[PDB]
Write a new protein. Sequence first.
Length: 429
Amino acid sequence: GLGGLERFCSPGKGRGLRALQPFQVGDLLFSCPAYAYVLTVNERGNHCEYCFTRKEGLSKCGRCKQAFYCNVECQKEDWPMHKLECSPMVVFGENWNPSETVRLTARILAKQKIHPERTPSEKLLAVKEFESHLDKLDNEKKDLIQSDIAALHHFYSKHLEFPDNDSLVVLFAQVNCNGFTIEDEELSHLGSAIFPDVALMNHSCCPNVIVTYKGTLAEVRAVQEIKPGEEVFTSYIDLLYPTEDRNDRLRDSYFFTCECQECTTKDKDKAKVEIRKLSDPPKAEAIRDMVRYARNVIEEFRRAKHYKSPSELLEICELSQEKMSSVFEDSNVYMLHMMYQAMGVCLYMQDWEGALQYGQKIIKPYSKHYPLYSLNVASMWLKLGRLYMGLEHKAAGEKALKKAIAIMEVAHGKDHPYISEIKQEIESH
Ligand SMILES: O=C(NCCCN1CCCC1)c1ccnc(-c2ccccc2OC2CN(CCc3ccc(Cl)c(Cl)c3)C2)c1
Ligand SMILES: C[S@@+](CC[C@H](N)C(=O)[O-])C[C@H]1O[C@@H](n2cnc3c(N)ncnc32)[C@H](O)[C@@H]1O
Ligand SMILES: [Zn+2]
Ligand SMILES: [Zn+2]
Ligand SMILES: [Zn+2]
C-alpha cells in the first residue's frame, strides 16, 4: 500500500482512502505515476508527448509530424503508446479524429497487454477494480459509450486485441468515473490520464486535499489538517457554484449526491446567488426565472464557442450580463461565469487590456466563494499577474504573482517547477 494511509469501506461512499497518521496543510500524502496518459491534440508542439515538459525546441516525430519530444529518449520511451497513433494519423490524415477518452482507453488496453500485473500506480486500487456504474447508465450514456467503442475499433484495431462489447462498455464507464484531466498552472487543459490510487479518493465540496501534476505524476497535498482515522477527500468539480448546481454535476458525471458540510448547510448558496438590494426587492419567482435563464445561457455559450466568432461570443457575455444585472449582483456566480468566459475570449484574441479588465472584477468574489486554498483562485491571481507584467504594471504584477505563489506553495509544493517559473518571472522583471 501507501505509508500513513489505507483503503477502507466508507459507509455510503463505497471504497475510500483513510489517514493513519496526521497530515499538516501543505504536506504531500502521496504521489501517483500515470498508469496511462495522453497529451491533448491542441498542446502538441508545446509539451513533450512522453513527460509533458513544456519547452521550446521540442523534436518532431519524423513520420507523423504530429508528436513532439524533449529528445530521442522521450521519443523512444513514448513509442509503445505513440505507435497506436503514428501511422494511423498519416493514413487517415484529416479523417483522424478519435475523442480524447478513446485515445486514453486505447492506451489502457495496450498497457493491460504489455503489463497485466499490478503496477506501482495501483498500490491501493487497481484499474480492474474501478467502479463503473454500468447499472446506472441511461440511453444517452450508452449511446455515447457505443460511439466511443466504434471509434476505438475504427482507429485502433492494428495493435489491440479487443474484448467483447460488454467488457468495453464497462471499461469506457470505468474511464469516465475514474479518469483525470491534467491542467497546467493556468488550469488550461493538457491531457487525460489514469491515476488508480488517486481515483480511490472520494469527493467533498470542502476537501482536505488537492491534486496537482508534476509532468505526468499526480501529487496529493493536504489543504486542511488531516488526523488518523479521517477520510481523505478531494473535490471532483468546480466549487464556485451553489449546492443544486454542484449536485446536478455530481449526479450527471459521477452518479451520486454529495452530503458534505457545504451541501448540508448550503452556507455559501446565498452569497453565490447574490441579489441586488433594490428599493422594490426582486420577487422569489423573478429570482428563479433569472437562475433558469443563467443556466440556459451557460449551456448556450458552451455550444456557441464551437462555431461563433469572437465578437459574437463577447456579445453573448455582455448581453447576458446586462439582463442578469437587473436582478443579480456582480459577485453572483452566474455573472462571474460570463465574465470568466469573456476574459477567456479576450485572452485568445490577445486583447490583454480586455482580459485584465475582466480578471480584476472576478478575483475578489472568487476568493470569497472558493475554499481557502483553491487552484481556481491561484490560477486567476497568476493570469492577473501575467497580464499586469505583460502590460508594464510590474508592482501590481509582482503582488498578484506572489498571491498565486502563496496558494501554490500549499497545493503544488514549495519546490514545484511552476513556482520556480513564476519566481523567474518576478526576478527577470
Ligand atoms: O479530472 C476531471 N475532473 C476532476 C476530478 C476527477 N476525478 C477522477 C476520479 C474521480 C473524479 C475530469 C473532468 C472531466 N472529464 C474527465 C474525464 C477524463 C478522462 C476520461 C473521461 C472523462 O470524463 C468525461 C467528462 N464526462 C462526464 C459525462 C459522462 C459520465 C459518465 C459516463 Cl459513463 C459517460 Cl458515458 C459520460 C466524460 C475528468
Ligand atoms: C473515482 S470513484 C471513488 C472511489 C469509489 N468510492 C470506489 O469504491 O471505487 C468515484 C465514485 O465514488 C463514489 N463517491 C465519491 N465521492 C462520494 C461521496 N461524497 N458520496 C457518495 N459517493 C461518493 C461515487 O459512486 C463515484 O462515482
Ligand atoms: Zn520529454
Ligand atoms: Zn509519429
Ligand atoms: Zn458537497
